[PDB]
């Protein structure tokens, strides 16, 4: 598994 | 705002 | 996967 | 904010 | 199992 | 901050 | 049974 | 900090 | 049974 | 600190 | 985003 | 965006 | 975008 | 876009 | 765009 | 356009 | 994010 | 993020 | 992340 | 984490 | 207009 | 016009 | 017109 | 004209 | 309008 | 408006 | 506009 | 606008 | 606004 | 605004 | 009318 | 009317 | 007429 | 008429 | 008309 | 006519 | 009306 | 008539 | 109008 | 007539 | 009727 | 009847 | 009949 | 008839 | 007939 | 015949 | 017949 | 006959 | 026979 | 027979 | 896989 | 794969 | 693949 | 394997 | 295996 | 398996 | 197998 | 088997 | 099994 | 069997 | 019982 | 308007 | 408007 | 008993 | 506005 | 008894 | 705004 | 009894 | 503001 | 007996 | 046991 | 109104 | 034990 | 109103 | 025992 | 009305 | 065990 | 009305 | 077990 | 009416 | 009443 | 946009 | 954005 | 009343 | 962001 | 009264 | 993050 | 009164 | 982390 | 009044 | 330990 | 009534 | 440990 | 009746 | 562990 | 009735 | 883990 | 009736 | 993980 | 019956 994120 | 997403 | 957004 | 996350 | 972890 | 975890 | 933990 | 635990 | 621990 | 318990 | 704004 | 204003 | 006006 | 106006 | 007015 | 009118 | 603002 | 203001 | 700010 | 400013 | 008579 | 008359 | 008569 | 009569 | 009467 | 009269 | 009247 | 009367 | 009158 | 009146 | 009888 | 028996 | 029993 | 029986 | 009968 | 028997 | 009989 | 029987 | 009478 | 069984 | 053993 | 057996 | 055994 | 046991 | 068995 | 078993 | 397990 | 087992 | 195995 | 595994 | 992410 | 994102 | 994207 | 992450 | 992470 | 976190 | 941590 | 770990 | 580990 | 560890 | 009604 | 009714 | 009544 | 009412 | 009312 | 009210 | 009332 | 009430 | 007021 | 209140 | 009611 | 009733 | 009432 | 009562 | 009240 | 009952 | 009942 | 029953 | 009914 | 049962 | 409103 | 209302 | 209101 | 509100 | 408000 | 906000 | 407020 | 907020 | 405040 | 915090 | 009780 | 118990 | 219950 | 037990 | 039961 | 069980 | 059960 | 059953 | 059962 | 599983 792997995730990324970014908000803003 | 923006956002980003990664999987795998 | 990749994911992009861009709202406002 | 960013985050992250790995299982496995 | 693993985990991973990264907020800010 | 950070965060890992594992089980067994 | 085994846990593992680091939070900061 | 940092934890562990142990059950068994 | 059996317990284990480690805090900080 | 450091903890341990056994019941049994 | 979320905002309230109760008066009373 | 989410905006609510109770009055009362 | 949402809007809400609750008076009472 | 929505807008609600509850009266009451 | 959507409009309701609830009066009551 | 929607308009709704709810009296009661 | 989430804001509250209640106001009584 | 969360934040709330009771003024009263 | 939470805050609140109790005022009275 | 968690903060709190009760002011009174 | 309405009216509600709830004896009991 | 409506009118509602429960008895229990 | 509507009238309504729950009894019980 | 309506007339309901639920009894029970 | 609405108007409601509980006795009991 | 509404208005109640809860006699009990 | 809202009014209760509470006998009891 | 919001008005009890609360007797008893 | 909102008022409350408790007689008793 | 908030106004009680308690009286008793 | 409306009777109520708990024994217990 | 309405009648009620709990036993218990 | 309506009649309730619970026994328990 | 409406009868009811709860054994437990 | 309401009655009410605890034994108990 | 209607009879009603939970048995639990 | 409402009437209230506790015996205990 | 109606008839009701829940064993359980 | 509303009537107490606890017995005990 | 009916009748019904519901064991369950 | 009721009964209880609270044995501690 | 009704039985408890609290052991504790 | 009921009957309950809460050990603890 | 029913029973329960809850050990804990 | 019921049992329950709630370990914990 | 009903039975339950949570473990937990 | 009726059986459940819920381990958790 | 019914079996069920959920777990968690 | 109806069978069910809920995991999670 | 029927069997269901609903994993999640 | 199943993935959800609710913000707000 | 399923993948949802509900923003609000 | 699915997607959804509910803004509101 | 199901992962939800609710941000507020 | 189910995994939710509440952050606020 | 489940696990939960939640941060606040 | 159950787990939840709540931090804060 | 249930485990929780409530740091504050 | 339960266990619980409030620390705070 | 139950086990609850407060530190603090 | 006996019953009436009058409107207008 | 006008009614009229007798039960039983 | 005008209203009538009268019940046994 | 015996009811009246009057709007307007 | 008018009311009018007579009870019993 | 008898009431009255009078808005406006 | 006005009022007006008389009781009994 | 009586009353009166004035606003504005 | 202003207010106004008679009981009795 | 009689009040007044006035804000502003 | 045994038990009795009469009304009216 | 008239009432009778016995126990046991 | 044996019980009776009356009331008007 | 009148009242009557009698116990064992 | 045997008991009487009178209002009015 | 009139009723009667006995139990075991 | 056993049971009776006689209405009217 | 008459009734009859008897269970095990 | 067994059972009986027997109704008029 | 007539019944009979036998279970087991 | 009366009422305006005006977007935009 | 534009609006214009009247009631009554 | 714009908005306007009169209510009254 | 009056109200107005602008965003943007 | 910006915001704007009058009532009353 | 009169209000503002501005974010960002 | 940035703030803004007036009341009044 | 007046108001402000800055983090980070 | 920073923060800022003004009141009054 | 005015104020201040810093963290880490 | 033992126990016994008897009554009636 | 009978009651017989062992412990231990 | 071990346990007995009798009734009847 | 008739119980049996045994724990561990 | 272990457990037993017999009920009959 | 006769139960079996073995954890562990 | 293990389990077992036995009935009848 | 048997049962088995295995975990992990 | 693993499971089995069986039946009968 | 028989039953057998593996996930992962």
Do not use: A
């Not at 598994?1 to 803003?8: N, P, Q």
Request: no cysteine; glycine share 0%; net charge neutral.
């Amino acid at each position: 598994f792997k995730f990324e994120f970014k908000f803003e």
